[PDB]
């Protein structure tokens, strides 16, 4: 339902830049950071898009030229795909599954190399696609440390304090090609997704939709991603995917999205809309209370499930025995 | 394959006193207690019938008259069934399953009351059936404490020592009516089943046949019994019951059966063969080694399964949420 930019510059995007999927969605509310309803949503761990935080104001000038000039000669992680659809592997979990080959590999490189791959691809119709995903640190240049220093630390530190969250664990810079998709997954941390350049579509699903989204086993390298291909969903294997309902929004420069911990997210950079730049802020969640309430919340049951899987992997001495044990435990007994 | 008693007294039983079932079995070996192969079997936790231990020699004179005279005015637990098939409930686990009524109840009573129920039933064709099952203690009479004192404690204490087992936890006296069946279940302790009067058929199945025998959930009051009705097995729900294979034997006066911990057992007092008397000896098993070997043994995986179920019951605050969580964790992910 497209936003009109200030100065009559016409709709920022239209519906033809959105991919189409099998499930319905409702909109994540767009609110002011001074609106108490926004504070309610965050405190109840539900998503909201805050339109006026100024969280990353000084990075609103970033583009590829400014960045290439000012970032430094660091190594930037740069992921790859032959399709629009990216797949992250945990390279430590690779010991596990023999019957396995990378199909979206990390390449290390310097920024200018990326800017030139990027723009070479462009001049050859390439379905060959790249995603830069790299922690900001100290190895970055002077003009970028200054920018970063001007982020709205007052606001975000108040949020960490008020919500009782733990420490800021990381801050990634993400630079996407148009059409790029990061398929549905969930993160264990609380997230502020700070949009800087171009437009990203975010479809979220809550923690109680675990059973419709069929993540990989915990020991699999794609731990926490959905096994369901959103473009060609296999309802024979994943029959509850036909009961999935999402929350969605499109965020552009200046918007911040609160992605609550354990919420599923699918993130797509709009078709024909250019390069997208985003920065994220990840925090450890509050510690669990002493006072346990019953019944537990979906995320807590999700946490227990992960733990059963992790323990069983260690007790059996081999993650390939986890499946057969689980199946033996449940058939003819709990169905 | 029937044993001929000493003094030409003819076969002790014939095959027509055995019920018939759907699965094949092989015989548990009958050996001398002085045979090293018997010591091998016990040390490897496999069943053996020891024919000459004298473990309960002085109780070989017990019958209902001698016992009624000499046991005392104690309360004897006495279980009931309208069918040949008994069902034990754990009365503490009854809080759990609302949708539940006893169908094989404990009645307390004095021995003479039992002897008279028993013999009244007899004079009225009754499919109404009783099983006395009660720990020996100190409240028993003088002539029975003397008998008990003459059990072969030398031999059985040597076995506890050599196997590294823990303490003797209990010693039950069991007095069964003919035709009685105790359906397949497993116990967590090591067991010497000491037969005294009449004949009992014992079909055992090892720990790695868990998946064919479909025990009740751990929180169910019939925890550790098979859900499969051996007389009318439901292969739609319990399809791997058609791969079950058993070890079987018939034990009579003077025989002792080693039932290894976690081994399934089904125990039937022969049709038309009279009242049966048995005493058992249960021991805690050895503690697990420091040196863990991989892969684990079937009983150890059975122990892990029980623990996952127990924990999850407590973490969720409600055992009815265990099933749905387990199912959500496994479908489309580990099948
Ligand atoms: O923040 C995240 O959890 C995330 O998964 C993400 C953030 C920015 C772009 C993108 O493709 C993915
Ligand atoms: O010893 C046992 O584990 C047992 O289950 C048992 C012992 C004697 C008679 C009977 O019906 C059952
Ligand atoms: Fe994420
Ligand atoms: Fe038993």
Swiss-Prot record, chains A, B:
Ranges for region Interaction with VHL: 1-111
Outcome following mutation: residue 187 to E: Loss of HIF1A Asn hydroxylation activity. Slightly stimulates 2-oxoglutarate turnover
Location(s), subcellular: Nucleus; Cytoplasm; Cytoplasm, Perinuclear region
Signal peptide residue numbers: none
GO terms of biological process kind: negative regulation of Notch signaling pathway; negative regulation of transcription by RNA polymerase II; positive regulation of myoblast differentiation; positive regulation of vasculogenesis; regulation of vascular endothelial growth factor receptor signaling pathway
Cofactor(s) named in the record: Fe(2+)
Site (Important for dimer formation) location in chain: 326
EC numbers, comma separated: 1.14.11.30, 1.14.11.n4
Domain JmjC: 128-298
GO CC annotations on file: cytoplasm; cytosol; nucleoplasm; perinuclear region of cytoplasm
Known partners and oligomeric status: Homodimer; homodimerization is essential for catalytic activity. Interacts with VHL and HIF1A. Part of a complex with VHL, HIF1A and HDAC1 or HDAC2 or HDAC3. Interacts with NFKB1 and NFKBIA. Interacts with NOTCH1, NOTCH2 and NOTCH3 but not with NOTCH4. Interacts with APBA3; binding inhibits HIF1AN binding to HIF1A. Interacts with TNKS2. Interacts with PPP1R12A. Interacts with ASB4. Interacts with UBE3A. Interacts with ANKS3. Interacts with NECAB3; the interaction is indirect and seems to be mediated by APBA3.
PANTHER family: HYPOXIA-INDUCIBLE FACTOR 1 ALPHA INHIBITOR-RELATED, HYPOXIA-INDUCIBLE FACTOR 1-ALPHA INHIBITOR
Function: Hydroxylates HIF-1 alpha at 'Asn-803' in the C-terminal transactivation domain (CAD). Functions as an oxygen sensor and, under normoxic conditions, the hydroxylation prevents interaction of HIF-1 with transcriptional coactivators including Cbp/p300-interacting transactivator. Involved in transcriptional repression through interaction with HIF1A, VHL and histone deacetylases. Hydroxylates specific Asn residues within ankyrin repeat domains (ARD) of NFKB1, NFKBIA, NOTCH1, ASB4, PPP1R12A and several other ARD-containing proteins.
Protein name: Hypoxia-inducible factor 1-alpha inhibitor
Organism this protein belongs to: Homo sapiens
């Amino acid at each position: 339902e497209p936003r009109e930019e200030a100065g009559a510059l016409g709709p920022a995007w239209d519906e033809s830049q959105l991919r189409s999927y099998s499930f319905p969605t409702r909109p994540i509310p767009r609110l002011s950071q001074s609106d108490p309803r926004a504070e309610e949503l965050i405190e109840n761990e539900e998503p909201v898009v805050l339109t006026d935080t100024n969280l990353v104001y000084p990075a609103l000038k970033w583009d590829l030229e400014y960045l290439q000039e000012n970032i430094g000669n660091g190594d930037f992680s740069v992921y790859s795909a032959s399709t629009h659809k990216f797949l992250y592997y945990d390279e430590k979990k690779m010991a596990n599954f023999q019957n396995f080959k990378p199909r979206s590999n990390r390449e290390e490189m310097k920024f200018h190399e990326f800017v030139e791959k990027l723009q070479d691809i462009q001049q050859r119709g390439g379905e060959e696609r790249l995603y830069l995903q790299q922690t900001l640190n100290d190895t970055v240049g002077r003009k970028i440390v200054m920018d970063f220093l001007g982020f709205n630390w007052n606001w975000i530190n108040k949020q960490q304090g008020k919500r009782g969250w733990g420490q800021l664990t990381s801050n990634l810079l993400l630079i996407g090609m148009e059409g790029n998709v990061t398929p549905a997954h969930y993160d264990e941390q609380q997230n502020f997704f700070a949009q800087i350049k171009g437009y990203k579509r975010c479809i979220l699903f809550p923690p109680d939709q675990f059973e419709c989204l069929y993540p990989y086993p915990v020991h699999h390298p794609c731990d926490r991603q959905s096994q369901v291909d959103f473009d060609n969903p296999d309802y024979e294997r994943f029959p509850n995917f036909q009961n999935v309902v999402g929350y969605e929004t499109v965020v552009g420069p200046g918007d911040v999205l609160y992605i609550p911990m354990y919420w599923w997210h699918h993130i797509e950079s709009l078709l024909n809309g250019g390069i997208t730049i985003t920065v994220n802020f990840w925090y450890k969640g509050a510690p669990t209370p002493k006072r346990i309430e019953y019944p537990l919340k979906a995320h807590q049951k999700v946490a227990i499930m992960r733990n059963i899987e992790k323990m069983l992997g260690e007790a059996l001495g081999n993650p390939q025995e986890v499946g057969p044990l689980l199946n033996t435990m449940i058939k003819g007994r709990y169905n």
